[PDB]
Amino acid sequence: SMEMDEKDFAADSWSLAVDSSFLQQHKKEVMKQQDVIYELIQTELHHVRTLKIMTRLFRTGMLEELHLEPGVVQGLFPCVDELSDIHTRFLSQLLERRRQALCPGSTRNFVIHRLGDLLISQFSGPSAEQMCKTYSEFCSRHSKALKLYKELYARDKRFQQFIRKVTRPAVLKRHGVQECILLVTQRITKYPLLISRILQHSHGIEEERQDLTTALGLVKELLSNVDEGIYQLEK
Amino acid sequence: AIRKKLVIVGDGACGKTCLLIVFSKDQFPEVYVPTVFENYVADIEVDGKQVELALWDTAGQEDYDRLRPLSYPDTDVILMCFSIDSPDSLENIPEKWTPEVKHFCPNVPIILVGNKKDLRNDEHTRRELAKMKQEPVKPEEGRDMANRIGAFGYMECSAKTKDGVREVFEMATRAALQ
Numbered sequence: 001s002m003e004m005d006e007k008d009f010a011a012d013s014w015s016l017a018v019d020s021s022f023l024q025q026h027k028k029e030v031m032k033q034q035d036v037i038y039e040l041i042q043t044e045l046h047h048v049r050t051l052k053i054m055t056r057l058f059r060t061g062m063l064e065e066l067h068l069e070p071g072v073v074q075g076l077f078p079c080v081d082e083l084s085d086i087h088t089r090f091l092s093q094l095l096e097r098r099r100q101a102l103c104p105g106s107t108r109n110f111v112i113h114r115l116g117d118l119l120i121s122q123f124s125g126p127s128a129e130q131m132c133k134t135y136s137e138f139c140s141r142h143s144k145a146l147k148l149y150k151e152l153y154a155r156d157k158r159f160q161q162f163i164r165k166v167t168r169p170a171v172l173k174r175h176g177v178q179e180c181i182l183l184v185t186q187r188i189t190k191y192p193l194l195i196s197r198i199l200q201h202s203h204g205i206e207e208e209r210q211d212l213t214t215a216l217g218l219v220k221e222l223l224s225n226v227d228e229g230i231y232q233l234e235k
Numbered sequence: 236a237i238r239k240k241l242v243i244v245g246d247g248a249c250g251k252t253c254l255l256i257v258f259s260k261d262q263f264p265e266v267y268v269p270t271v272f273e274n275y276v277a278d279i280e281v282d283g284k285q286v287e288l289a290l291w292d293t294a295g296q297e298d299y300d301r302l303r304p305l306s307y308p309d310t311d312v313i314l315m316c317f318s319i320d321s322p323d324s325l326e327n328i329p330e331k332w333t334p335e336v337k338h339f340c341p342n343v344p345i346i347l348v349g350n351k352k353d354l355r356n357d358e359h360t361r362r363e364l365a366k367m368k369q370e371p372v373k374p375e376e377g378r379d380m381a382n383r384i385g386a387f388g389y390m391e392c393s394a395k396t397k398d399g400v401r402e403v404f405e406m407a408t409r410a411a412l413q
């Protein structure tokens with residue numbers, strides 16, 4: 001994660017992120033909608049950060065420092081490059097939508113009025129098919145990644161010292177190897193919760209309520225497809 | 236400090252996400268209550284023992300029977316939640332959640348937690364429930380359910396007022412240690 005986006009998403013809500021003289025200019029309904037939209041982007045930034053810890057810190061760190069058997073690192077971090085591409089692109093579009101909405105003279109005051117169109121695009125067509133295929137693969141390999149990690153930690157001293165070392169900073173407290181895997185698996189089921197609460201506060205413009213209702217139906221169709229395509233792989 | 240994993244289970248309207256948020260912040264959020272909970276690792280000292288308690292929610296996974304059990308590996312304690320303002324969420328405990336938690340987590344202690352205990356004294360809650368020939372869950376109904384399913388124990392709390400929240404998590408830590 002980069003300092004620019006970390007600071008834009010440091011506050012606990014949109015009402016605390018913007019200047020109070022800008023907050024005062026908006027209706028409470030707008031603030032409620034914006035707080036949930038801010039939470040969607042903030043958690044998407046954290047999810048992308050989680051995927052960067054898996055690819056750059058864990059996966060690459062193991063390749064450059066350890067002497068693991070070929071295919072072992074892939075079994076510990078399945079589909080992480082594909083996932084990191086899917087979510088960094090989605091995050092880029094969310095951050096660009098916020099940036100275009102900033103007032104001139106401001107790096108923090110914005111109102112996102114149109115999100116549904118962006119959500120329909122991510123959860124339909126080729127991008128939806130790539131998320132369905134990547135999550136069905138990832139979640140089917142989830143158990144094996146955990147078992148393989150536990151096998152290497154208990155039997156390999158060098159793997160144990162590598163893990164203890166790269167996970168020692170306080171910022172990585174809730175981001176160990178097993179934590180990253182479950183954080184990734186659970187991400188897809190957070191979307192309907194976030195979108196339904198945004199929709200609850202987006203009835204002001206009928207076009208937006210319809211776009212968010214379509215987006216919610218698409219995310220649920222994706223989730224049901226991923227759920228049907230899963231079968232745990234055993235080693 | 237030993238590492239222990241806690242998973243909270245229960246129906247959508249049981250208040251499990253709010254319980255984890257109020258515990259991890261040590262406060263009921265004054266400006267915004269988050270929609271979701273990612274994870275958290277609590278530093279807890281119970282009965283002289285320091286433990287790192289990783290906290291996990293199952294919210295959003297209630298409809299996905301193949302995705303939901305991926306939250307269960309290596310669990311040390313299960314918090315099984317129901318809402319005191321919802322007697323229908325208590326009825327789902329023995330025939331839906333209990334067989335699932337016993338299959339995927341054999342020999343893991345379950346604490347049955349009655350949430351929203353403040354609503355037992357709410358006039359709007361008592362009025363809305365009476366229209367469907369119902370009333371708030373009584374403490375003996377919660378205890379009898381915990382007994383029937385073979386739970387480690389029965390506890391109540393209010394995430395809204397913070398009453399009983401710290402106690403549930405210190406007890407869960409003790410349960411995970413046995």
Ligand SMILES: CC(=O)Nc1cccc2cc[nH]c12
Binds near residue numbers: 341344345384385
């Ligand atoms: C269902 C359940 O709670 N099983 C269980 C496992 C391990 C310890 C205890 C203590 C009471 N119950 C226990």
